[PDB]
Structure formats: C-alpha cells, structure tokens
Homo-oligomer: 91 residues x 2
C-alpha cells in the first residue's frame, strides 16, 4: 500500500463490513470519500468531531464519536491530524 | 418515582456506573443536570444531537451518539422530545 489517501480509501473499502468512508480537515473540507459517505456529509462529520473535542481536554485524548442507528454505525476519530469517518453495516 | 425531571435525574444518579446526566431541548437549553455534566456542556451536547440527526432521515430513527475517551462514555439520545446525555465511567 502506497502513502496516498486514494489507496487508503480503496483499501478501507475492501473490508466487507465497511460501506462508507470519508476524511475531512478540521473545518469540513472533504479530503476524499467512498461509498455511502459523500460531500454532503463532510460538514456534519467535521462538526461532530470538533464538538466532541470540546467535551475533553487532552493530553491528546482523541475522543471517538460513534453514531448508531438502524442504518448502521458511523465511527469518527482523528488520525494524524485528519478526521476519519467509517460507516459500518453490522447486523 | 413521580413525573418530575428532578426525580428522574436523582434516580438516574443512583446507578453506580453513572457519573453525570444532563437534559437539553433541541436548542441547547439546559433543562437539568447532575454530576459531571453541567451548564457548560449543554450547548455541545445539543449540537451533537442535532448534527447526528442530520446523518439520518427517520422514520423517527432516533440515532444514538456515543463519545468514548479515557474519561468514560457519554451517550446522547432523544427521549420524548428531550435530548438526554448520560456520562458513564466503565473500566
């Protein structure tokens, strides 16, 4: 695997339980997405991560946001400065 | 248990694994809190719930937000029109 976001996004989608993935910067800029997660979700995902950050105070305690519904689970966490969201279909 | 929020909040705190609880309306108005969750968190909690609502489209699919960190788990969900957040210390 080479160090491009594109290759990371493609590899992530090889996981059969993963139906979507989206990465943003800290202001909702859509860095890249696949599957169920697209441009329209970028802003919401970034706001969720930024708001979650305010319910803590480090040291670098990166707080994980998980949203659960009938349509599966979205897990949002920062990795190396980037906000990464993954949509998984469990059942 | 009588039907007052105060009695509900007090009863909720009887759960030994629960360290905080806060209820807001859909705009962050702090309806009542106990423990680790206070006025300062009301806005964030409401924004988390309102943003989570935008990642779905019903029918009344109330999407649960769970934040996880070293300091425990906060679970945020709407119950009967109200946004309810519960802070649990697991370990």
């Amino acid at each position: 695997m080479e160090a491009t976001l594109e290759q990371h996004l493609e590899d992530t989608m090889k996981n059969p339980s993963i139906v979507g993935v989206l990465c943003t910067d800290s202001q909702g800029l859509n860095l890249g997405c696949r599957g169920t997660l697209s441009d329209e979700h970028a802003g919401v995902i970034s706001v969720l991560a930024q708001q979650a950050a305010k319910l803590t105070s480090d040291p670098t305690d990166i707080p994980v946001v998980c949203l659960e519904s009938d349509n599966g689970n979205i897990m949002i966490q920062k990795h190396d400065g980037i906000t990464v969201a993954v949509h998984k279909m469990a059942s």
